[model samples]
Target: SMQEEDTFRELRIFLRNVTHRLAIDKRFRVFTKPVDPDEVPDYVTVIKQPMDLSSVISKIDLHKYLTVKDYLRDIDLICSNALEYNPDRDPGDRLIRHRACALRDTAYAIIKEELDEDFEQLCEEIQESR
Candidate 1:
């Protein structure tokens, strides 16, 4: 019963992640069908929150591929990872520091190529060849 319970608990966590990945996008906006006019504020403003890119790269599950959403979710766990009530494995916690390297290199390579001219050359422009 003990082993089975642990497996089941892990499965629950995995499923929750999968569901969120499929159903939500961090950048997506939400709107309602005009409920009570008074309840709705006159205006809603959006503030862009800076995500910790380094933290995101540092905590990817080594065995699985990740989307940007997964990156966001995992990295967001960095601070509170150990706050759970005796969590067996803290989300995004790891035995080793992987922060020096970025995860999900494959997709970023193509993306970098597109933005390379704008960014990649700027470093060299300053140093003139390090």
Candidate 2:
């Protein structure tokens, strides 16, 4: 049983590695523009508005997209692994919490970097709207 568990662990690790590599190779694009503004999805339209960042964020469902879902799932997995592999301490130990927090922060940084101008404009509009 132990041997089988080890084998499964190795297999999962290998699969994860392969998936990561494939994701990298694909250079996937998350949002693409529609030819007509009216043709855009309601979510995309809301996001495009200069003052709707809060609404956009609230409406976003990361789990709806495989890429975003996988990214978040990986963070959850890492946290789980950190605790499982070292259960002497509390399950929600500092080390695991820090790791998850760092991952989430990194994701936020990436999002901000990618949407810096749009986000700034949205914030400005929101301020003006108030």
Candidate 1 TM-score versus the reference? 0.21
Candidate 2 regions with alpha-carbon error over 4 angstroms: 1-58, 61-92
Model 2 per-residue lDDT at 39: 57
Separate clash counts for every candidate? 0, 0
| Candidate 1 positional error at 35, Å | 16
lDDT of each: 0.31, 0.37
Q: Put down candidate 1 lDDT per residue, 24-88, tens digits, no spaces.
A: 43321111011223663432222122223332222333422122333334434331222221234
Q: What local lDDT score does residue 64 receive in model 1, on the 0 to 100 scale?
A: 27
lDDT of 2 by residue, 30-83 (tens): 111122446534433333332111222222332221233333454444434444
Q: What is the lDDT of residue 51 in candidate 1?
A: 26
Error at 75, model 2, angstroms: 13
Worst 10 residues of 1 by lDDT: 27-36
Pairs that collide, model 2 = none
Scanning candidate 2 in windows of ten residues, the lowest lDDT window is: 26-35
lDDT of 1: 0.31
